[PDB]
Amino acid sequence: PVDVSVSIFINKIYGVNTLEQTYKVDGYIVAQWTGKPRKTPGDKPLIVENTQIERWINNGLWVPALEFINVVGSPDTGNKRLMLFPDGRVIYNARFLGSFSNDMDFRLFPFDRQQFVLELEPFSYNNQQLRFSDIQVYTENIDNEEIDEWWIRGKASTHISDIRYDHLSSVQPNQNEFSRITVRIDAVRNPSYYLWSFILPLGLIIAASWSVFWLESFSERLQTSFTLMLTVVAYAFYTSNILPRLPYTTVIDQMIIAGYGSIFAAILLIIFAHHRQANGVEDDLLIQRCRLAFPLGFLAIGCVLVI
Amino acid sequence: PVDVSVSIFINKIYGVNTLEQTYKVDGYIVAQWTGKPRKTPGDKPLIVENTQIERWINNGLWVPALEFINVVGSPDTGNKRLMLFPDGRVIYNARFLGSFSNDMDFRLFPFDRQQFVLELEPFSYNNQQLRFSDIQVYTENIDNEEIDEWWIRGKASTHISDIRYDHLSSVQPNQNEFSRITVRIDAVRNPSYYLWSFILPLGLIIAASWSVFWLESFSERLQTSFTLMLTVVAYAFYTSNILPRLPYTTVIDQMIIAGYGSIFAAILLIIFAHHRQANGVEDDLLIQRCRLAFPLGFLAIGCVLVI
Amino acid sequence: PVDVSVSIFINKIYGVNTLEQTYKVDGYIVAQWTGKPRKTPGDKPLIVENTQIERWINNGLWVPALEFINVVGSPDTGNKRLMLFPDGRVIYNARFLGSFSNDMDFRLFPFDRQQFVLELEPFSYNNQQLRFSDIQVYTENIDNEEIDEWWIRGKASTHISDIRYDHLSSVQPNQNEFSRITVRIDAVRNPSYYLWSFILPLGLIIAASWSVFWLESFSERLQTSFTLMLTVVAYAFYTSNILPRLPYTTVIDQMIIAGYGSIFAAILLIIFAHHRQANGVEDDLLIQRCRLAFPLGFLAIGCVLVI
Amino acid sequence: PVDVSVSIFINKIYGVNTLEQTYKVDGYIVAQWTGKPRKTPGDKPLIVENTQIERWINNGLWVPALEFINVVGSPDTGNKRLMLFPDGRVIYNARFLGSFSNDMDFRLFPFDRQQFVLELEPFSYNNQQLRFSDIQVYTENIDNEEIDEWWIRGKASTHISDIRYDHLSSVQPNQNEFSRITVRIDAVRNPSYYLWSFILPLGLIIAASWSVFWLESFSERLQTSFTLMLTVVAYAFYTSNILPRLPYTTVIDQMIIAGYGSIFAAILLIIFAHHRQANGVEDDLLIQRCRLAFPLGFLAIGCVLVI
């Protein structure tokens, strides 16, 4: 009933792939388990680097394949080493860089929370069980991440449960429960850039759109609308090119629709004000003085987007 | 005439390449077939991991190469294992990530169907036959697809047919029929994002184009048209940059031309309105009152685009 | 002087790189040639799959290297198999996918003609000759290129010629002539998409530009032109991002320049209309009525663009 | 306590990945260390190239794995050679190209300060220490950066420090201190292109925005403001697409937000001038003559962005 200790050193997470739901993790991994003792050179432990390891297997060294369950494609294995002890126990060490997969919601784009997860599990062993799992990191929050991508409000989160896999259990009846280490790391999106540089300009554009009501004539009002209309389309484009592509509406992406709407609603009022009259051409007394009433109407509906 | 069991675990479909007609499939695959019984260590089945497998072949172990017929390029093979049973039967297991090809129509872009398909067939064996095929997916539709991209409808279509391959049969007369597994999965595109953020703004922009007939003057009418023209071209760009590039007209793309036409037709009326007159000056009294006759004409053309 | 029959199964191409002049080809290749007989297990021919093939070479099996002359970089060799016959003849089979290069003229962009080419020739053999060559495409022209950019044309083209290579021919005097299979498949560009969505709106835009002459004033005429100018600049951008990048002027690219001229010519006329008078301020009575004389002037130069 | 001399020849930096904080370094690396003396063919030193090196290891030649700690994924090892000297000493030479990572502040974008760094450390040895470190570079500052992208202020550097690694350490009590070479090179972004072609055009536009106050009418003033609004949205787009993507506000990114504001502030004054009056419609006599008082207000706040 083989015991396996596991420790995973995390060096770097990088590259969220918003569409494919994919991120890259570089780091090391450690497995420790005790086997039959052997004579080593001297009596100090014997060290085996890279290319040499595969040879020891051909002479009867059992070395379990540890698969990353949730990695997308075999990861980049850097240097790898074995530490064989004269008393038997064996240490497998390897550096990796791999593209891992997990479910993640991006609907709250400028203010995200995400959880990056690793799932390690032996490739073909059910009564070889994973003893304990450990990780690390070295950072400081809240501090220097007005420089950084986002804050890692969060920490370790170890699991290591057992998985059933109820399919073709008759291949080996009664035994198909595999030991799976699961690690998860929480993180929040530093909104600084998307607020200071995206949320703000869009609102001003939407806000400046309302100043159309202070134009004295009607032709002035209506013609200006199409320039404001064009202004939203441009900002919608600048939004879409730079922001990460997604198959749903982000908070920013909804704000873009809010601009498209606010200007189109004015379009209807500007026209309906002209032809809801007592004669033929009269801008309805009290109607064109929604100058500070359209901003109130827009802000009122923009508080139901929150809850 | 060797019998071969096959089981295919499907983990993930992701990243369709609309231009090249290509999608990626990550998962596992299993092959089982019984051969001459042999002595294993103890009497437990023997487990052979990764590199050791290629060695076992050099001692005369026949292991059929199973090629993916519809894969584009050799796939990324992760971990692989053999299970040699003392009673003869052998279970080949490997994790695979590969880019597969299938016919895909994207003309109805925001409302696709589609069928993701696998085709497995031994690389050099016609008597060796595929016994039975199974597929395993652990997803839920419709449910979390507001965070994903696709809705899946079908869920397990399996075939296992036979192929003729009638070329150069005199090399071996009478025998050239191969056993081919066929897996097919139906799926539908989540129209949500392209409606709320692409179909929606485009219609409003096209709709606002019609309000030009409510401009009083003719210089206003004709001059304003050119501003609307620019608005469509801009939105065509924003459409073209973010939407997946294709060599045919999508539904949006047809709606995009619909705008281009409405504006050029409006241009024609606006000018024809001015010089289809009685004497000096008269803008044809009723023709500038197609204010809600141009909207009706467009929706009529937008209902024959559907069927 | 060994004879070698070769047949090339072509599966798909699909991904043209217009700048690098490059297309991808996936398919199979077969080589058959008769050698000294041998004893096979039983008397059935012996099958060798992939890694085992390289083992047979180390025991003196000569397997000629067939190089793709016009492939850019080593192609992806999928599965490969040998067929060793008891009567001597040997069949080499392999699946390939590679990016090939050929000269391709794209000057007539929306209406291209191309020739996709494979060139196979042994890597180091002058008196080992290719017996006869075969090509298996199956597709059905005119038909499905409604969905794929191209259109298949004339199909199979085989040569099997001799090459001189007169440089360092003194390295091996009197013998430097190689047997080269040459495959060529002609193709035409499906213009449907670029017409309905690029050529057509462009014509509408250029046509609408001429309508400036029906604007009454001169300040109106000149001012509106600058909006038309910006409209043309926008369409080049929308064109340039989506269309395939090239180092020469395509047909579309020329049509784009026509707008730049028509507007700049109008700018000059509209201004010259104002200051070609008898008295201070009189728009030359006939010249501003080139309203349907710019439409005629444009079309005359666009039929000398044809020949 | 094995001594190892190290010299790292740097051939090329380049291709900074501003988002991933990543740069590539091409060059050679040399390891020299004296071992048990013996006999070479003749007495000239023995040279072992590439594929041959891997053979020598299996007969007991210890060659330590030198890992690039800050490389992202195993780097590309070009050619490698061993020089075994008859007096014992051995020279390991290999050409490498790998993607290295380091912390990079880009908040000062057009005037960045970065430090590209190598961190070398043995993969599995605690009393085998790095003797001395050398680097070779051959550059000139301030001079060729007319063309080169990077001004260098420092003249390389070398550390060769000690690392604790206080984890896992009871596996080997008393011994867990590793030797790490650190090489660091200072460099700056060179403002020429971003000033002459990005900073300058932005400033001119913001200045021209203020000339809106010199329009006689109010409709002229307010309508034109929306045109300036549209222009800024365009320029933010042109900046964002071409400039390197970052998760924070660069100097340019800050300058962009100021433009968005100046127009919205002008819009408000233009309006407040109109309705901060003695009657109902009088542009407040002094306030619309902030024509050269908005420029003064802009220049004063743009000096607090510096400090």
Added chain:
Amino acid sequence: PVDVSVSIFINKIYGVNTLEQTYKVDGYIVAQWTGKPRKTPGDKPLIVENTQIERWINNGLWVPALEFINVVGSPDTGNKRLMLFPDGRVIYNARFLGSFSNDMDFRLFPFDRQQFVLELEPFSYNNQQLRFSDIQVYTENIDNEEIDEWWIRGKASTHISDIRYDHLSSVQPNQNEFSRITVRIDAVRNPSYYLWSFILPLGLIIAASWSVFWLESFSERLQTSFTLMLTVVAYAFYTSNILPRLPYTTVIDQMIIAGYGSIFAAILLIIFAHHRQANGVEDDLLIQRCRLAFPLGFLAIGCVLVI
């Protein structure tokens, strides 16, 4: 002091990386050198293809590793063959595809002169020299043609000089001079595409920019200019997106600044014309008649930019 002849067949140059200063070269390379005579099968020369080569080295065949000094990462080695002669001399042939680097000045962007370079040098041998070097190019110009991106001013140059490498000269005292082939090919920029399709439209816009002086009113003049400003920003974006990214100001990039200035300068005159008066509102009679004096002022500054 072994003599080695080298001949390099060049098949294709393609894919300039303007930022990284990098180009791709596909072709073959040939090495010829005379050694101890050996007995071959029969007396014909023996041919060794690919995988078989590395085996011959392990039996004492010395084959020098030839490194491309300015190649960025180890290149893709296609097929390789040995021709061992009974009289001793040995011919190494291999097809290579690799990414090479060189310094490239792009400041005169649309009209460059460039020099593509290969640099070959043995990896670990100082008294084995390159006898004579030959390369085969077949590049005729002016003619090729009809147009392209570069033209060819020659065929090549062939140094084959001696290198010092003065760092660590005591590794082997008194002998550290290596033989390095240097091949260089000159090329000139085919400007055709960038003139007709980029330079020409800019001039029309810049020329049309001056037509603002023929606008009658001042509100006409000043308001219209803000539209012209937008036109340049649009064109800079379209320029920068399609044109190759660079770290310095191209000729085009300066022409873009020339527009930015001419339009901003017009703004200044247009306003100064209004307030350099005798009464209060009189447009200074001669100054607004710089309509064809600003074209003259602009053309003069574009001729000292030349020298």
